[PDB]
N, CA, C and O atoms as a Tripos MOL2 file, in Angstrom:
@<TRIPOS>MOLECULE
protein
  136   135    34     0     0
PROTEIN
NO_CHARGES

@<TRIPOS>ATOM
      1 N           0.8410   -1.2170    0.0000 N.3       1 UNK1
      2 CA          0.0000    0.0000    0.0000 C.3       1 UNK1
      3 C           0.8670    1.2550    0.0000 C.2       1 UNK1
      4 O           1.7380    1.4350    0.8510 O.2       1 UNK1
      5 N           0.5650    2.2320   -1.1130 N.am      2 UNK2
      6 CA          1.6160    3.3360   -1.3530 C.3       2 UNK2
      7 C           0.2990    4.4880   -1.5960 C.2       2 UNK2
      8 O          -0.5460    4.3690   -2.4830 O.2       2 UNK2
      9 N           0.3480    5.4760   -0.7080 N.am      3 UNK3
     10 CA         -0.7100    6.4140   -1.2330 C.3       3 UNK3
     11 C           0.2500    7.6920   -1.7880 C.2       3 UNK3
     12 O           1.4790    7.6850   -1.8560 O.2       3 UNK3
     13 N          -0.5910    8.7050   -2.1330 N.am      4 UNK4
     14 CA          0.2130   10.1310   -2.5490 C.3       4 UNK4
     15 C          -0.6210   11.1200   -1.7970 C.2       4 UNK4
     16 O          -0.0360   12.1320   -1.4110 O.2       4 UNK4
     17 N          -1.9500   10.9820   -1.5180 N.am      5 UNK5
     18 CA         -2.8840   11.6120   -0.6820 C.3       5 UNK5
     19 C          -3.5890   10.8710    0.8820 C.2       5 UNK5
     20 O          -3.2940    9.7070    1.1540 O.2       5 UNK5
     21 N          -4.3460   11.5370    1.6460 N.am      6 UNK6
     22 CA         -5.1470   10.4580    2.5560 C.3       6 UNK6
     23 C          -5.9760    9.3080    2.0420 C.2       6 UNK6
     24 O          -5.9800    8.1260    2.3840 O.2       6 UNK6
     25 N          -6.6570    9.9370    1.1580 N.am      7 UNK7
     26 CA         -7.8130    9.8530    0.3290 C.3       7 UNK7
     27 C          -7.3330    8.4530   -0.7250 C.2       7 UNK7
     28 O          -7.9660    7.5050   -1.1880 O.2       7 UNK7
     29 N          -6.1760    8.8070   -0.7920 N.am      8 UNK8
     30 CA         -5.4610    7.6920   -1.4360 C.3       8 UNK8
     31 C          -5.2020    6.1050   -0.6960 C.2       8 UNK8
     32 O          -4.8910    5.1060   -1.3440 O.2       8 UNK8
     33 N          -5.3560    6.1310    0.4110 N.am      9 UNK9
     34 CA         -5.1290    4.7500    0.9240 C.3       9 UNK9
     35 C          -6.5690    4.4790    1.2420 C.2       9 UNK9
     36 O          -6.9150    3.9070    2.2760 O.2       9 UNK9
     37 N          -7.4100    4.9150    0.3080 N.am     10 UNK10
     38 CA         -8.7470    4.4880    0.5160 C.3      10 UNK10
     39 C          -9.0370    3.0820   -0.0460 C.2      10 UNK10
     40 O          -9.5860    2.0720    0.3920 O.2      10 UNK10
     41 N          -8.3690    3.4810   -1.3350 N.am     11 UNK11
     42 CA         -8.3730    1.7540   -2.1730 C.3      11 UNK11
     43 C          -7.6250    0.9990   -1.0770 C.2      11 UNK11
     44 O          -8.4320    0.4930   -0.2970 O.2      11 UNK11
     45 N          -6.5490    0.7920   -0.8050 N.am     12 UNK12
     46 CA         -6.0470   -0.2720    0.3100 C.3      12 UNK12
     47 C          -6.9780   -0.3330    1.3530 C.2      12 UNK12
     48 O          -7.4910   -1.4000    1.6870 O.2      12 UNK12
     49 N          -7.1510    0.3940    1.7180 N.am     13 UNK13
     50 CA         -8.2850    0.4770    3.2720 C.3      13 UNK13
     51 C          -9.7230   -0.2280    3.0050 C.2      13 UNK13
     52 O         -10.4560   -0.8210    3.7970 O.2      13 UNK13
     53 N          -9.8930    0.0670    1.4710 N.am     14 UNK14
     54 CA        -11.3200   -0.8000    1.0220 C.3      14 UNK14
     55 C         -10.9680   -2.3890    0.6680 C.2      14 UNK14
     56 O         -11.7310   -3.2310    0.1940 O.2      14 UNK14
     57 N          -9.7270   -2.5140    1.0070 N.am     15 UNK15
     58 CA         -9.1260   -3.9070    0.8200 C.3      15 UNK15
     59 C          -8.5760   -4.2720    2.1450 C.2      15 UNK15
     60 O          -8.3400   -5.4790    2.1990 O.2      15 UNK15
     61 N          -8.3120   -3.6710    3.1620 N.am     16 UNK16
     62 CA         -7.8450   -3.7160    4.5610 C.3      16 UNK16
     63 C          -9.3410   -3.8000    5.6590 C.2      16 UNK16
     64 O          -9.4650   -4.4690    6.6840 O.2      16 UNK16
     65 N         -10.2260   -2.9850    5.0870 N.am     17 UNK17
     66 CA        -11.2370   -3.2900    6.1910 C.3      17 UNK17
     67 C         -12.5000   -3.2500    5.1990 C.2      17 UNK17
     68 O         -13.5580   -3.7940    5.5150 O.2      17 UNK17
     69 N         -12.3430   -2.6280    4.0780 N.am     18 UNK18
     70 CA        -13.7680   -2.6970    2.9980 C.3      18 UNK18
     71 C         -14.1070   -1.0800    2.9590 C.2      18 UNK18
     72 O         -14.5990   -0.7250    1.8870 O.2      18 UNK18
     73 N         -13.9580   -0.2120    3.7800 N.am     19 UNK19
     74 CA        -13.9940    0.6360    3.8810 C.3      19 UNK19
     75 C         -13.4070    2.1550    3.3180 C.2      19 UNK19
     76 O         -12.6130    2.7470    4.0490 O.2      19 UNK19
     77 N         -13.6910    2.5920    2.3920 N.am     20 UNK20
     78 CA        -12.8620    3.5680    1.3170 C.3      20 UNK20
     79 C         -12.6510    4.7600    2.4120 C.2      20 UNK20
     80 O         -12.9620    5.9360    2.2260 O.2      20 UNK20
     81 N         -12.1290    4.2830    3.4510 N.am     21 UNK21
     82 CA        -11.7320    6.1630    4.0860 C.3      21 UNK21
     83 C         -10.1940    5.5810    4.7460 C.2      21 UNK21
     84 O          -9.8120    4.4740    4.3690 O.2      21 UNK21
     85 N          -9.5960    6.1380    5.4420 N.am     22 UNK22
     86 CA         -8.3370    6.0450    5.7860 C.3      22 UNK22
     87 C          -7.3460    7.6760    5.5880 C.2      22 UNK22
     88 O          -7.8430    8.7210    5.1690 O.2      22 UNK22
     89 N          -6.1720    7.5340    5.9310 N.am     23 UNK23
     90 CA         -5.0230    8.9290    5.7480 C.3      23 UNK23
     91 C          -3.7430    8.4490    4.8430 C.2      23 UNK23
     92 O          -3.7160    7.3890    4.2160 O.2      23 UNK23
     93 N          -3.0330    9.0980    4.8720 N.am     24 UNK24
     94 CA         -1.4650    8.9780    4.0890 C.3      24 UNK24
     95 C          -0.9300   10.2930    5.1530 C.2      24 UNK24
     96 O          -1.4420   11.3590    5.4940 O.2      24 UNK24
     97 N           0.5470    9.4990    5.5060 N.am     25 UNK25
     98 CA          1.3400   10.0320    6.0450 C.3      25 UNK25
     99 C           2.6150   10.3840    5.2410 C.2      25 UNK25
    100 O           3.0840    9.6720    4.3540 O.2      25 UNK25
    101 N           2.9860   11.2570    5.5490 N.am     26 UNK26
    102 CA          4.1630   11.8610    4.7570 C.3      26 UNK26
    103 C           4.9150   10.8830    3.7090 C.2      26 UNK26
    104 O           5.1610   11.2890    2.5730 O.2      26 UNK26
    105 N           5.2270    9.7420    4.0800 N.am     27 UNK27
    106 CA          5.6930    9.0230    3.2100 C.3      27 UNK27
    107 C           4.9310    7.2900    3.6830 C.2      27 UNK27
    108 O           5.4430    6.2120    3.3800 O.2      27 UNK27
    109 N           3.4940    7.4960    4.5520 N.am     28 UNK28
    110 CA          3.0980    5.9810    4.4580 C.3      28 UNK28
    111 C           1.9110    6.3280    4.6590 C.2      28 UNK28
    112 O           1.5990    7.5120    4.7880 O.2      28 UNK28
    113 N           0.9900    5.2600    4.7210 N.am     29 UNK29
    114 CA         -0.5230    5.0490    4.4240 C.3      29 UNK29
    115 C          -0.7960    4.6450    5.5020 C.2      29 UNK29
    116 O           0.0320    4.2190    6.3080 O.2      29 UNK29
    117 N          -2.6540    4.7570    5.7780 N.am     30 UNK30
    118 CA         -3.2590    4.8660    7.0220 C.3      30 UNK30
    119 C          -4.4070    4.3230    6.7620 C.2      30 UNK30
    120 O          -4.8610    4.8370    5.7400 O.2      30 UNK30
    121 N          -5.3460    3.2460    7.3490 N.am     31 UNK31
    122 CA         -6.6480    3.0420    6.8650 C.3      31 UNK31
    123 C          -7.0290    3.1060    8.2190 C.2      31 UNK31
    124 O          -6.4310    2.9100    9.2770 O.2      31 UNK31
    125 N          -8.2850    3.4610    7.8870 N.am     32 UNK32
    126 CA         -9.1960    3.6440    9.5690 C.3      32 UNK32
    127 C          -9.7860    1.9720    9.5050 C.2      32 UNK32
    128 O         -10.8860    1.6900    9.0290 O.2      32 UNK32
    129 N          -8.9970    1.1350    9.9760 N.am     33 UNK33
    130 CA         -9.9560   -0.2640    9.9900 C.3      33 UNK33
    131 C         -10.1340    0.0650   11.4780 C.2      33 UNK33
    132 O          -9.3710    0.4640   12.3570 O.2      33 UNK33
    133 N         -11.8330   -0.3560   11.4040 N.am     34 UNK34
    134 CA        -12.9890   -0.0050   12.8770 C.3      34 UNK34
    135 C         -13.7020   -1.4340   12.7640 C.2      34 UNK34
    136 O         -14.6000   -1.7400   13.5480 O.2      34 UNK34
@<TRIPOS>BOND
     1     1     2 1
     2     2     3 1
     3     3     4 2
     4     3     5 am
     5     5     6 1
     6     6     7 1
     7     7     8 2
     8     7     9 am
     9     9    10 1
    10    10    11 1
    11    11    12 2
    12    11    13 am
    13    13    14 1
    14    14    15 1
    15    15    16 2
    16    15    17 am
    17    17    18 1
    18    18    19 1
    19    19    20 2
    20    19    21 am
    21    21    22 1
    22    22    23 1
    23    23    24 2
    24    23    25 am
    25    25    26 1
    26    26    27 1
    27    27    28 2
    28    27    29 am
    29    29    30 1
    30    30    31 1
    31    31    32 2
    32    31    33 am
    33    33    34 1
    34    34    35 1
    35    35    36 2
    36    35    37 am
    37    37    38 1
    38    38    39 1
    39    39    40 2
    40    39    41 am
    41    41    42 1
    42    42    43 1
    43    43    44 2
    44    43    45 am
    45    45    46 1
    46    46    47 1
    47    47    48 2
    48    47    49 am
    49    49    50 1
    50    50    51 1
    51    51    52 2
    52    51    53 am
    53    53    54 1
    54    54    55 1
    55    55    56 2
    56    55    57 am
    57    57    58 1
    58    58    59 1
    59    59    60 2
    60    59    61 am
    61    61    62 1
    62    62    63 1
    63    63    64 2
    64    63    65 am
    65    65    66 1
    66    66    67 1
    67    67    68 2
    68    67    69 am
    69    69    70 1
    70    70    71 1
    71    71    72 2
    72    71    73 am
    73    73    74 1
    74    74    75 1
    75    75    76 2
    76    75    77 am
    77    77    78 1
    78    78    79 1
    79    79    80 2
    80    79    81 am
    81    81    82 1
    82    82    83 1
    83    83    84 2
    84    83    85 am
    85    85    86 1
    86    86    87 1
    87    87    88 2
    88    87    89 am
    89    89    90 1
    90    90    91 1
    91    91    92 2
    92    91    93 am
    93    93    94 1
    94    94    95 1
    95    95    96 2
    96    95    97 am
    97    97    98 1
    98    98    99 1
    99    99   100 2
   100    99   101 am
   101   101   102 1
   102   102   103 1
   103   103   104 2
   104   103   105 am
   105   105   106 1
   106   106   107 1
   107   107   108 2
   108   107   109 am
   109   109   110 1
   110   110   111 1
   111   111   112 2
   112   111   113 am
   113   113   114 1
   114   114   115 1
   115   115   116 2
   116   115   117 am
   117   117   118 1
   118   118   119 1
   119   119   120 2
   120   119   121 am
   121   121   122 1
   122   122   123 1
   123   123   124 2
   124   123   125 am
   125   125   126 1
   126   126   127 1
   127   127   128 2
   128   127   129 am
   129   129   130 1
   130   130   131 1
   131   131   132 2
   132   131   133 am
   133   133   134 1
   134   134   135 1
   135   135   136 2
@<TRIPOS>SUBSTRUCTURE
     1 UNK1         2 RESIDUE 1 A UNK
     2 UNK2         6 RESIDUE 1 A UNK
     3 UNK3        10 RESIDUE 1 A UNK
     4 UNK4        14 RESIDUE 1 A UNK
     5 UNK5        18 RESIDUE 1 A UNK
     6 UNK6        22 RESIDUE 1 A UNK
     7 UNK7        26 RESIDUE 1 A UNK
     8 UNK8        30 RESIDUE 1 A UNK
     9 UNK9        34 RESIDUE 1 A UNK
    10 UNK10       38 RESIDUE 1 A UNK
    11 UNK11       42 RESIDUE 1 A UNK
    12 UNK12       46 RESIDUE 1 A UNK
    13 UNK13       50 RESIDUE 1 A UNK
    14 UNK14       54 RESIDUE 1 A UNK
    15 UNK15       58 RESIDUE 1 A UNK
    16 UNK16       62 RESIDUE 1 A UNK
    17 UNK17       66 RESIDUE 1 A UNK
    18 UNK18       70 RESIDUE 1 A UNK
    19 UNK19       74 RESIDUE 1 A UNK
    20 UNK20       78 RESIDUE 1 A UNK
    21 UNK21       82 RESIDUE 1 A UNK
    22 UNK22       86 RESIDUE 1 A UNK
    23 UNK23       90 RESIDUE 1 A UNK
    24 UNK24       94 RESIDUE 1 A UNK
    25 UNK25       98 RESIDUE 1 A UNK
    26 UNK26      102 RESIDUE 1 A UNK
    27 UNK27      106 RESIDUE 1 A UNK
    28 UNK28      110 RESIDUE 1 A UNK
    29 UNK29      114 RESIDUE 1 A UNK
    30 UNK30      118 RESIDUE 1 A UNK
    31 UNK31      122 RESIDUE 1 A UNK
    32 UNK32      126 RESIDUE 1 A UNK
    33 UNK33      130 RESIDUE 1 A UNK
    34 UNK34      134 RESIDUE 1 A UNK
C-alpha cells in the first residue's frame, strides 16, 4: 500500500477493512480499519 494523498489509501483500506476512508502520512498510508 503506497498512497500520494489520505484519500489515497482508501483503495487499500477498502481492501484492509472494505472501507474507502483512511489517511497517508508523509511518506506511508493509514486506513481507519474499525
Amino acid at each position: 500500500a503506497s498512497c500520494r494523498t489520505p484519500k489515497d489509501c482508501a483503495d487499500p483500506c477498502r481492501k484492509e477493512t472494505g472501507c474507502p476512508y483512511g489517511k497517508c502520512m508523509n511518506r506511508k498510508c493509514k486506513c481507519n480499519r474499525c
